[PDB]
Amino acid sequence: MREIVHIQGGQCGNQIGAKFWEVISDEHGIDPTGTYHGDSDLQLERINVYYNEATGGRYVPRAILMDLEPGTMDSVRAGPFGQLFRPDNFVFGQTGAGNNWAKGHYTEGAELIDSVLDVVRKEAEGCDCLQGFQITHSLGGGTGSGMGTLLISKVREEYPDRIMETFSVVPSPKVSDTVVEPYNATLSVHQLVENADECMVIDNEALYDICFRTLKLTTPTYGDLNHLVSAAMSGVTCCLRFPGQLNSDLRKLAVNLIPFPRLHFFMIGFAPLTSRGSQQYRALTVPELTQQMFDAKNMMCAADPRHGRYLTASALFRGRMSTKEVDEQMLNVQNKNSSYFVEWIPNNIKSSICDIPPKGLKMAVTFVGNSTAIQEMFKRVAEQFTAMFRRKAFLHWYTGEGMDEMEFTEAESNMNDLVSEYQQYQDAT
Amino acid sequence: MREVISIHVGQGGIQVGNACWELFCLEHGIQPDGQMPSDKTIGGGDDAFNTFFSETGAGKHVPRAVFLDLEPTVIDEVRTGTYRQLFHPEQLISGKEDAANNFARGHYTIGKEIVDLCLDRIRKLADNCTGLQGFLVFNSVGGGTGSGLGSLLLERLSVDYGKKSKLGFTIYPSPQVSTAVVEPYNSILSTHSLLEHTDVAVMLDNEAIYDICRRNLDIERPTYTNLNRLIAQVISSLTASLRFDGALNVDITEFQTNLVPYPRIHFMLSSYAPIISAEKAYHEQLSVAEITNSAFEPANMMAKCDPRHGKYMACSMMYRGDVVPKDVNASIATIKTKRTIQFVDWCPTGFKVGINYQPPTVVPGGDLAKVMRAVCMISNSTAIAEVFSRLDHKFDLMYAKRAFVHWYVGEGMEEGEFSEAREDLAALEKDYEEVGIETAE
Ligand SMILES: [Mg+2]
Numbered sequence: 063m064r065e066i067v068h069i070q071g072g073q074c075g076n077q078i079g080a081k082f083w084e085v086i087s088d089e090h091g092i093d094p095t096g097t098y099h100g101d102s103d104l105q106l107e108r109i110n111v112y113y114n115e116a117t118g119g120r121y122v123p124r125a126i127l128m129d130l131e132p133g134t135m136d137s138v139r140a141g142p143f144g145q146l147f148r149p150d151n152f153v154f155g156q157t158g159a160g161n162n163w164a165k166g167h168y169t170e171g172a173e174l175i176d177s178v179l180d181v182v183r184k185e186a187e188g189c190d191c192l193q194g195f196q197i198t199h200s201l202g203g204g205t206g207s208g209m210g211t212l213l214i215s216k217v218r219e220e221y222p223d224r225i226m227e228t229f230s231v232v233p234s235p236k237v238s239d240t241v242v243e244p245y246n247a248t249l250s251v252h253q254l255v256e257n258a259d260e261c262m263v264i265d266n267e268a269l270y271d272i273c274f275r276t277l278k279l280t281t282p283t284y285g286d287l288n289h290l291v292s293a294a295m296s297g298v299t300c301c302l303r304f305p306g307q308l309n310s311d312l313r314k315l316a317v318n319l320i321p322f323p324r325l326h327f328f329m330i331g332f333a334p335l336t337s338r339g340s341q342q343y344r345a346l347t348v349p350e351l352t353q354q355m356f357d358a359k360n361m362m363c364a365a366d367p368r369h370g371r372y373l374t375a376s377a378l379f380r381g382r383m384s385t386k387e388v389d390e391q392m393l394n395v396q397n398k399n400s401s402y403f404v405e406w407i408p409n410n411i412k413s414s415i416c417d418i419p420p421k422g423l424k425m426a427v428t429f430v431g432n433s434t435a436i437q438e439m440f441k442r443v444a445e446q447f448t449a450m451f452r453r454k455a456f457l458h459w460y461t462g463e464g465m466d467e468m469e470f471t472e473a474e475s476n477m478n479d480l481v482s483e484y485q486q487y488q489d490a491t
Numbered sequence: 492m493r494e495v496i497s498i499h500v501g502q503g504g505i506q507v508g509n510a511c512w513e514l515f516c517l518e519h520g521i522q523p524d525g526q527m528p529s530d531k532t533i534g535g536g537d538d539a540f541n542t543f544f545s546e547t548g549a550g551k552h553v554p555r556a557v558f559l560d561l562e563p564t565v566i567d568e569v570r571t572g573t574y575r576q577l578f579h580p581e582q583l584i585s586g587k588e589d590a591a592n593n594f595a596r597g598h599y600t601i602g603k604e605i606v607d608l609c610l611d612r613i614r615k616l617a618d619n620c621t622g623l624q625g626f627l628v629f630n631s632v633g634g635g636t637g638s639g640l641g642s643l644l645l646e647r648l649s650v651d652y653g654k655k656s657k658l659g660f661t662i663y664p665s666p667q668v669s670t671a672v673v674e675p676y677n678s679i680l681s682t683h684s685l686l687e688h689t690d691v692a693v694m695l696d697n698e699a700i701y702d703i704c705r706r707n708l709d710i711e712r713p714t715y716t717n718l719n720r721l722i723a724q725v726i727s728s729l730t731a732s733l734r735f736d737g738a739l740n741v742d743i744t745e746f747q748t749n750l751v752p753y754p755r756i757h758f759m760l761s762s763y764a765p766i767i768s769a770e771k772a773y774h775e776q777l778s779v780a781e782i783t784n785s786a787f788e789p790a791n792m793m794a795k796c797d798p799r800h801g802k803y804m805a806c807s808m809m810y811r812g813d814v815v816p817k818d819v820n821a822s823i824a825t826i827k828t829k830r831t832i833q834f835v836d837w838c839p840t841g842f843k844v845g846i847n848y849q850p851p852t853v854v855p856g857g858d859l860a861k862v863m864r865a866v867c868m869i870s871n872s873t874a875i876a877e878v879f880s881r882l883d884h885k886f887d888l889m890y891a892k893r894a895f896v897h898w899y900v901g902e903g904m905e906e907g908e909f910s911e912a913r914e915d916l917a918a919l920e921k922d923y924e925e926v927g928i929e930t931a932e
Contacts, residue, residue: 191587307715313591318671321894384712386701389668408885409669
């Protein structure tokens, strides 16, 4: 039915989806136990395309658990809504990748892929007209990417028609949570540029910036952050989940978002984002949220539209309004800062609306535009990879996995090729 | 005896359809379930609802129209909506996975998937019908099946019957407002496969709906409800002759090779009026001359293409209500009078009156005020080629950059379809280019 599935690895991402399904449960108001306690059939109408009824009305996720060590499995296993799960999917590891990506990709990569792809495949038979599935990990290591690389390869072959919308955490330029990041990252991204269908960037520092400045929060954790992102990743299917006077699916999205298949790394904007007092400063209009939409500070990725140029831009609106406003602000904005709008893409802004906003708010905005400002991102990470690969720093942890360096060259001149590729598209008219 | 049937496609398109059948059912006032509030007396002289609302052996009078689109969510709302007693299950055919606005998908890829079901339904209705004149087909160059799958639809339906009229209501990419960017691809790929499968059809653009509803309906913040209501009115009157007594109950087939004199450039504008408020319904009088002179306001032009930049060819000002042949007639002299307007002189006058005696009915909850007289200026000029030219230049560059082409080439279309379809708008550019040339001497 255009239903989809979720698969998460990732040192964080395993938590991320926990929050995610948590949020969707709220938007479906079904008890933690797994039965519905809401007030409209509309939550039940399209419930299946994420959930699954069970005998007795156990309502369940179409999620897939990735992990190389059960702790997360216990963690979310210790999770509220944990009784809303299926024990089947608790597919984890006994070792951990140690985030040498070769470890999580050959060593443990080849070790535990099979049981996953089997049960996942059983989910594939459980899906009537599968629009797709949602993968989640991080692009700097192996706790997610280790195996998730193998996932994208295997299912991608196994389902060359299905959509692969991939969110994985990008290392911020400043803070290096690990120094093996350039290598895991580069080795992964070689794969992901080939095999993944959609990708959107996952920085932490942006999420900090949101929580601290625009959220005006002092105490950052993951969980709030995954609230902030699963807000958007939860919004994305809204029309696909719920009616909309102007609907567009991921196929309409990506096909209406990408000129050439190498450009499915997208940046993200969601809003509104206030602290409590703000409403008693300000109110909500479509033009208002628009005035956030093109905010670099909501630009939750390491790329700057202020520095790069919008190759593409789009808006995901959930609520009840007048599109006569919506479009009007659209075109207005597409003029107002025309210069950061790439040229030969006429009407490079594109529209949407969901008859219902997310719960709690009256109107919704989402922006997954695609400039080319990410070039500094790949340039950076490739740069650090370059330095220590001059040094071969921690190659020994690496070659101990029994990869070659020439692969590193492959993702290397590879990833540079993708960058310059974005250069010419940005530098053209 | 005089049947037509409606076909509905694309998100906005079936939105239009829903508004429409809401409308007509309101206008004959047959209750949403399928019954009239009261018994129908036996009489003769002309048809009634029987055109479209379908007689049962009881108070069950379903439209003669069909839904087809590969994006099946919204249609379910009809499947749920109040008229779930109105419509009929086999009236409903949808696709699950729509085109993603791949023209080539629901035209090619998913084009293959639901066609036969469609044609069977068509055979059930036309076999159910007798004097079905023509075909009401609605779709959109946006809700992607509205382009692709409809393209196959007429592509084959024409080859099925042929002799029926093609009544074409589809939406055209607004000039600067839009919905996507592949719209060039949708449109032109439609167009070269549209024309020779089309008889005649009109181009409704939205931005006019906005600007005019906001000024003329005094609308503050509109949407597809208002739009679909407005097109609901215009189609409501474009066929009254087959529904209601009028002095010159002109007909579609009558319109065909007379409005569009040549075979080729067979589309047109349509600025309905009088759309005003309850506070302008009063504080006004709304003369025949007001609707008439007002009918040719380029700023009233209900599709964003300046008439004053074009030269008119025909104008079928079919009228609802208390119309006078004389008064309108002299107004038409007034239209000959308009210096700014210029006509395909080799067609000096091509006018064709429509005076149907029922004035308009209003939909409760609507914004239009009530009047006594309606106009439909289905008129054809030289002007409309330009925005096409924008379409082929925009599409020209974007296609030159091969943008998105992977999407379509991935689904089974060839490049010469693209460049050649650009030759198609080349030719039609020669057509609006040539027919507008004034014949020598
Ligand atoms: Mg559709």
